[PDB]
Each structure stands twice: as C-alpha cells, then as structure tokens.
Design a protein around this ligand. Structure first.
Ligand SMILES: O=c1[nH]cnc2c1ncn2CCCCP(=O)(O)O
Ligand SMILES: O=c1[nH]cnc2c1ncn2CCCCP(=O)(O)O
Ligand SMILES: [Mg+2]
Ligand SMILES: [Mg+2]
Ligand SMILES: [Mg+2]
Ligand SMILES: [Mg+2]
Ligand SMILES: [Mg+2]
Lengths: 159, 159
C-alpha cells in the first residue's frame, strides 16, 4: 500500500552502519585467512541484506566470511533480515556463544521493536519499522516478493 | 594480479541475460503465490550472484522464489556462481529433475569451459573466464574474498 524504505535509503543507512562496525572492530584488526570475521546469515530472508552488506563492509576495509543456516576463537556477527519477535535470533546467539566466539554482535536490516516476545536489543540496526507486515529486500510472504528492491507494505486483500 | 570483470561489467551482462530469460519465460507467465519460478541457489559462492539477479529479473517482470542448498509442478532455474568442472551442477540438475519440474535450466555467472570434467552447457551465462583461479562476487579461496565487488585473479604468493 506504500513504500517504507527504498534501496537508496537502505544503502544510505548501511553506509553509517558499516562506518560504525568499522570503528568498533578496529583494534581487533582481522584479515582474510587469518581471522575472517564470521558473518552469520539466517536464511532465507537475509540473503539480500547479506550480499549487499559484506561488500559495503569491504568498502570500509572490513573483510568477511559468510556462513548460512536454516567456529571458536573467531569473532561472530549474526545478520538477520528482520528483527520482530527476536525468538529466532535469541536461539542463534545462544547456540553460537557455546563455541567460544572471540566476540558476538547482531546486525539487523529491519527492526520492529513493538513486536517483541522477549527483550532483545541488536547492536547495529539499519532501519526501524512500525508494527506492520512488510515485504521486499529479502522479506517474503509465503516465499514471494523477496525480489522487491524496496521494503514496502503489502495490501491485505491478497490473503 | 588483475581485474577480469567489475561489478558494472557483471551487471551489464545480467541486463541482457534477464532480458533473455524474460523472453524464454513469457508464455508460461507465472506470478507470486501461483507459480513462483524456483530460483535454486548453490551455497555459498552463489549468494552474491543470487541477490543481484533476482532483483534484475524483477525489473524485467520476472518474479522469483529462492531455495538454498549446501518442488514438482513448478519451473526450476538453478543458479551457480561459477561453472568449472560442472560435476556439482550435474548432480543438482539430475537430483532436481526427479521431482517433476515443469521446466529446468541453469544460469551461471562465471563459466570456465576449459575446466570441464564432463560435457555441460548452461542455458544462460553471464560471462566467460579463461582457466585461471579467480575470486570476488561470491567466489572464494578458503572462505575469503567473497566480499570483493569484482571478479579478479588472485596473486599466487598467498598459498
Ligand atoms: O514483516 C514481515 N515480513 C516478512 N516476514 C516477517 C515479518 N515479520 C515477521 N516475520 C517473520 C515471519 C515468520 C513468523 P510466523 O508467522 O511463521 O510464525
Ligand atoms: O576460480 C575459482 N575461484 C573460486 N572457486 C573455484 C574456482 N574454480 C573452481 N572453483 C571451485 C572450488 C572447489 C573445488 P575443490 O578444489 O575444493 O575440489
Ligand atoms: Mg547492488
Ligand atoms: Mg527472518
Ligand atoms: Mg517468512
Ligand atoms: Mg560454486
Ligand atoms: Mg570454494
């Protein structure tokens, strides 16, 4: 029914976010093959946000290494497409911290603070969205509309 | 040691490729929720090429639905990041055709025809590359350098 964030807007947020993640990961200073910085992507919705973010991090001198789902001694940065109930991200963060990560943070593209079932605050957020059902930029409704380059609100008369 | 294809070059090829896949998939005409067109992505190297291609297909009116690895009644389009020995893509195409796909083709980003162990020709190819070891745009060496926005040839003195 309306567009919330276009691809130009989503990239602009990820400029300062990558600039933020660059500052907070300066003293550790890890490079390819040595320590890669394990980008933990949560399939399937976060594959659009992952392919764009790992490149922008490389633009600011932050190498990456991507693992997909749905260790130890190395830093971990979990990437979710949307942070709503935070239940799925809670289980991943706890299950990952078991294999002694040298650091762990979370980076989400769309954050819905009003739809939480448990208290959870991500370290880096691209954009905030009110409590509505949205698609685009990896977000889907029954495995569809992920190809939309913008985060939009779907019309309810499709159900 | 040199750059083979930049992101601007890789996108330009995917313009005519998406224009090609749009023509060959016109009469079937399948839309979200109905028949999605199952984009079959082969992790991990093909996640950069998948996030860029599904959007470009949407720009030419071609909806998608992405599945990841490493059915029946619906069209299948497998996407690989690089087509070298074609052994990995051979096993996927055969294993997918068992569950009665209403169509099946292959779309690769980088094709190395000189490195084949078995004869295999993909329907759509973004770009051809001579028999060298390359990284970037999802391509990796020991889970690294995927974040490079361009397809480049790595220096041998890193081994
Ligand atoms: O706004 C949204 N767009 C797409 N997916 C979303 C959104 N908010 C939460 N999700 C997760 C859906 C799965 C939870 P379930 O309904 O399967 O239990
Ligand atoms: O040029 C390339 N860059 C990155 N990966 C490539 C390339 N060519 C083939 N691959 C696959 C590697 C796995 C085969 P194995 O060595 O594990 O058997
Ligand atoms: Mg892009
Ligand atoms: Mg999700
Ligand atoms: Mg979903
Ligand atoms: Mg591959
Ligand atoms: Mg590899």
């Amino acid at each position: 029914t309306s567009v919330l964030f276009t691809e130009a807007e989503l990239h602009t947020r990820m400029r300062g976010v990558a600039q933020r993640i660059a500052d907070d990961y300066s003293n550790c200073n890890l490079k390819p093959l040595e320590n890669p910085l394990v980008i933990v992507s949560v399939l399937k919705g976060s594959f659009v946000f992952t392919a764009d973010m790992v490149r922008i991090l490389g633009d600011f001198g932050v190498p990456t290494r991507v693992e997909f789902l749905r260790i130890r001694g190395k830093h971990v940065l979990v990437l979710e497409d949307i942070l709503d109930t935070a239940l799925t991200l809670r289980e991943v963060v706890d299950s990952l911290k078991k294999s002694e990560p040298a650091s762990i943070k979370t980076l989400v593209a769309i954050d819905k603070p009003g739809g939480r079932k448990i208290p959870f605050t991500a370290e880096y957020v691209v954009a905030d969205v009110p409590n509505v059902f949205v698609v685009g930029y990896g977000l889907d409704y029954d495995q569809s509309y992920r190809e939309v380059r913008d985060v939009v609100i779907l019309k309810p008369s499709v159900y």
